[PDB]
Amino acid sequence: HPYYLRSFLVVLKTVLENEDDMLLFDEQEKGIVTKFYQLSATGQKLYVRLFQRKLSWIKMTKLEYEEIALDLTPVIEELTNAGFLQTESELQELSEVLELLSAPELKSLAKTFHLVNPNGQKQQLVDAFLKLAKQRSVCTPGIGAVILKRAKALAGQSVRICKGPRAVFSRILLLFSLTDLSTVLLVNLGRMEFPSYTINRKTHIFQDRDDLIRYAAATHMLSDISSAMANGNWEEAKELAQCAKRDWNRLKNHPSLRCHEDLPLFLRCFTVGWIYTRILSRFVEILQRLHMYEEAVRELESLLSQRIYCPDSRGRWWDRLALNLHQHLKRLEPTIKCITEGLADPEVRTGHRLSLYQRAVRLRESPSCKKFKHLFQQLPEMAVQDVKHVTITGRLCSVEELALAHYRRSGFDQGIHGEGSTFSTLYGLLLWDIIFMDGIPDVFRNACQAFPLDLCTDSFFTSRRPALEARLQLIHDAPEESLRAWVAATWHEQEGRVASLVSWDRFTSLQQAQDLVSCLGGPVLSGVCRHLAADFRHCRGGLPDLVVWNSQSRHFKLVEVKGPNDRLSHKQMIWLAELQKLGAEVEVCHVV
Amino acid sequence: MFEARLVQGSILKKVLEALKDLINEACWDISSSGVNLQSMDSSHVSLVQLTLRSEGFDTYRCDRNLAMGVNLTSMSKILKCAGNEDIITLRAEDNADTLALVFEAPNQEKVSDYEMKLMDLDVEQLGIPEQEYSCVVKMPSGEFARICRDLSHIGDAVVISCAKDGVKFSASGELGNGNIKLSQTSNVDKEEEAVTIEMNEPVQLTFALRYLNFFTKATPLSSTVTLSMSADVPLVVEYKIADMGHLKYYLAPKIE
Amino acid sequence: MFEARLVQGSILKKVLEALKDLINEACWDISSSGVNLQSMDSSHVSLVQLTLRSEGFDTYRCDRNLAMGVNLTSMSKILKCAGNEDIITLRAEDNADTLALVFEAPNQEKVSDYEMKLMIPEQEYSCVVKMPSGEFARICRDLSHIGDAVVISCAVKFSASGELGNGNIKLSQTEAVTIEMNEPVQLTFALRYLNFFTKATPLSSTVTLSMSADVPLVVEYKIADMGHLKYYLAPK
Amino acid sequence: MFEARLVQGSILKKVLEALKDLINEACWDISSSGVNLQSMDSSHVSLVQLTLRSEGFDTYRCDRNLAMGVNLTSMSKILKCAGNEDIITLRAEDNADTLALVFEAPNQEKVSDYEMKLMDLDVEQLGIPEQEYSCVVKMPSGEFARICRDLSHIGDAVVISCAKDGVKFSASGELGNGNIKLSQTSNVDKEEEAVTIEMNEPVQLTFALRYLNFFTKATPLSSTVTLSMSADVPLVVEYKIADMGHLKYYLAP
DNA sequence: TCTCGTCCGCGCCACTCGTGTCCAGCGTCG
DNA sequence: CGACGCTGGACACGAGTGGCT
DNA sequence: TGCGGACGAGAC
């Protein structure tokens, strides 16, 4: 099997093995699945190819796949017998034929039909054809019938994947990707060997088939909004988002939502309301890209009004509300109220809390707010230790490589660009036993899971508090030999595994892992692993860009390497302060 | 075997020039009465009928009815070979498909014989009924051609409202809005500048202007054009072909 | 409403043909004295001045001055529909969003009406050269074939400087050519705009070119003593 | 030091315009007695031969042969703006100095001089020898130009089919096959419109209609064109030049 | 001029294709 | 005859789509 | 989210 069908078959197998996901489907859709399994290998390969490809008519001439078969007419015939493929005969919609036509062929048809512009933009010609189709013939019916016939004759044989089975497989992909085709998973998925864990599924995210269909609709809406954002079609994005908010409001009292409220936080991120709250966050993003900022702060207040969808991102929304309402809007007293609420909110953590604090101290120092005194009171005080700053002058290589070379001069010959993957890697290596530990409910659902669902969620610390606390103490009070053995044990046992925490290519060799672990020491690794274990979402970023150490000296320098146009991020400030508090020696490197 | 000599070869030349744009492949019916086109444009918005009576043709011969599907672009190219003066007899092959057109100069020194591929096209007859028309208008051909050109510069569609006072051609577009109206001049001399109109009921229609401009290409055939318009009935613009036959363009009303 | 009836509207057609090619947008300023249309070319090098007087037009009503900014690209097509012998009138109400023109053929059987949507200090030229415009058109076209710039000189010399070769043309007094020759003149101009000026010639039988050192050149066209068409040339 | 005065500069204008598109980057080998030119076409499939007698020009005084580097397109824009009635004189110094042309209109109210630099040139001098032709047909230049422009659409090649009774240009192509026949004139007027066939044996060779269309561009210069055909010999497209020269197009069938 | 803060584009790349511009052979009409 | 206008091939983009083991 | 560019806005 080639890679794309291998990925597809692994996704299908994983979803089918789930009894709950199978219950989520109707009997007909299981019929589509069992018909997909009832095809030749070339049939499956071509179906996966056409499925990865955009859902539009594709000319049989342009379908040239060397790996399946030199002539693919038998394969298309087999797929259209099976129902998945629609041949040109079911192409009775003029717009689809016109879009299928190439620019030269469309220009040729336009001359034949005496369009206004025989030459011009493809979309303009398509619209002109749609206008012409509605006119009356001299038969006194539809003129577009002749347009349809001529366009079909010109297009030639064309195929398109059926939307029914496509919806079935898209929903299958969504159910699989819940636990987490994307290109990273489209290729290599058959080869990626996932960590070992026992699957424990007690809670149902979806209740009825309609709930999963509704979740798929919400996910498709979110994907369309994100694609519009990426392509820069910001006005279309808002219209889709506004519709999406209208749909979210229409379903406000739907009985399925009452149980989505009772799903655990790490599972609640796979519900219709969760995706609509993410869609509203993207709605705030577009409102912010758009000039309007008043409806933006209104939607931030609306999202903030709920503690029950997306609490992990309340820091982001709090910072965006404060930023919009302060810089973009003249009023600052409600900014003070929002900030004093934000530092009070337990969900705001590790970088957005610092951002709110910095906004508060700016307002306190600023003469504009000097009349207000409520801000000074009840402002939690978390002063951040200043970090040593070193400036390096030098110069095509990456800036961080120049910093690596510079620290090679001052010792520190062994150095890796971790960028935060190094400390996550060491965290995974020293805590693989408890990150993937059994006996935590609903956090392993499918066998194809890189990370437990509790990870990136507050419940990861709470669920495994005994074991996590015990191991974190053990790492803190440990000799170099014990740490070396502990890291090497997991590098051996779980070699080649796939975890969102462990990047194997990050460390060139296990010997470098041993050396870096020895150099960092007990308390430093203990503190970093403790800050990553709890609230991993707000602590996974901002780690120092470069870790460097002299092999003989056993002395390290966790160095943040910022270019002349670069700045210290809030997460970076927090992490440098925390590493300094741990006994580590950190310093910011500026390279001009 | 079909044979028809035409002393005024410019008649056939301008006929093919007028018909070239609307139809690329048309059927040329062969009958004792004459040759009948009865084919429509590729867009099916417009229809053209070319009844060329055998009275004008000299030494007209037709053993049996012949379809004569002719690629009108190729025939236009072949007729462009002909001098405007040269006479043209069309010698249909007895049973094969090779329309032979021979052009002979009045000076008789030069003769130019050509054959055609004479392909076969799917025969189709609209057979529109001879519906009586209201508000028949008769105006010079060149005038109507000029109105079509001007309004095509102005707008994409043309609306026509006819009254006993006159007939009004108006177009509205992005760059402007325009209207032209003509009234029965009743000139005493009447060398076909007459704008005579017979009215039966007020009729207003909206028509596409691209095909209307394509209709103006038959200007050299006739100095006069008759516009007949009845509601829900396609416009009829007719060109009397030198008292030998007649060429008529139909155009279905635009819907909006 | 403001009305400017033109019994011989042909010259209006011709000036519109020139200005569509030269200028893109312009505003027709209407004063009771007359209609003046001077505006800036879409190109930096030249600006143009069209002057029309109220007395020349058959009808002249003007109570309020209207700029009537009109994209000449559309307006030229609108005036193109008018016949050479057609009587052209322009009607524009003081509160009219669109200017209107009406065309009436000499036989008066056909009436046409379209509405279209609407949006240099004097220096005494000591030396002046007048040549038949068709002639000046010919030098412009030929020297634009040869090159891109022409250096004009007095005794009537136009010199062609292109990388292909050199070309000189001489004109002498004798349809008539008159040069003051008050000072020697060596003024160079880009031939691109010079051939843009040439399109205006059907309007005037004689063209006037007056040179003054480091002073902008004007190609004035006399519109049947009814108005003047000034194109202002900025020397290189 | 070469001086040529041509009463009708229109003659040289049409010569250069008609011969412009056929041969690019050609050569000039003007003789001390008259003007003689010859070059293969840009695709080197056809040949053109030009001859201009010394006595035809009003005055003619030349000292030595010169390459006279030519960019025929440059010369074409030179003979542009030259009046049809304008008198054109070409004077050129030695050592490949720029060829300066003076156009004086008979009105004499205006006079113009243009000089174009001679560009680096090489003379290959094929010198294809002259030979007799089996059939020579005299037909009007306009008629021949129309015949070629007519067969161009319907055919890619033209069959000469000359005979004593007359000539018949036959063309076969996608849109059928066509043949236009011009018999012996047998006209009392003996006009230039007459077509006369001087031939000793019938001949049949197909010729590239494209290059024949290239040849017809000289139609304005000559009232009539004689065509000379011999088996396996490039056909002669001869246009009389005001009795001052003869221009011939050589195309190999 | 310097600094601090804020906003904005970001899969991968290589192959084919829509698009706009350019030059030019052909057609016009006076 | 020619000054001038025009719409059709040719070519470098900028974008989309697809293959990515 | 997490980065690298850019900009503006204030301080100077």
Author numbering:
A (entry chain A): 372 to 511, 517 to 556, 571 to 785, 811 to 1007
B (entry chain F): 1 to 256
C (entry chain H): 1 to 119, 128 to 163, 167 to 185, 193 to 254
D (entry chain G): 1 to 253
Quote the study's own text.
FAN1 (FANCD2-FANCI-associated nuclease 1) is a DNA structure-dependent nuclease ubiquitously expressed in the central nervous system and peripheral tissues that plays a role in resolving interstrand crosslinks at replication forks. It possesses both 5′ flap endonuclease and 5′-3′ exonuclease activities, allowing it to process DNA structures that arise during replication stress and repair pathways. PCNA is a homotrimeric ring-shaped DNA clamp that encircles double-stranded DNA after being loaded by replication factor C (RFC).
To examine the role of PCNA on FAN1 activation, we solved the cryo-EM structures of a PCNA–FAN1–DNA complex. In contrast, this region remained unresolved in our previous structure of the FAN1–DNA complex, highlighting the critical role of PCNA in stabilizing FAN1. With this cryo-EM density map, we observed a direct interaction between R507 in FAN1 and D232 in PCNA. The salt bridge between R507 of FAN1 and D232 of PCNA stabilizes the FAN1-PCNA interface (left). Additional structural comparisons between the FAN1–DNA and FAN1–PCNA–DNA complexes revealed that the angle of the 5′ flap double-stranded DNA substrate remains fixed at 68°, and no significant conformational changes were observed in FAN1 between the two complexes. F Overall structural comparison between FAN1–PCNA–DNA (gray) and FAN1–DNA (black) complexes reveals no significant conformational changes in FAN1 upon binding to PCNA.
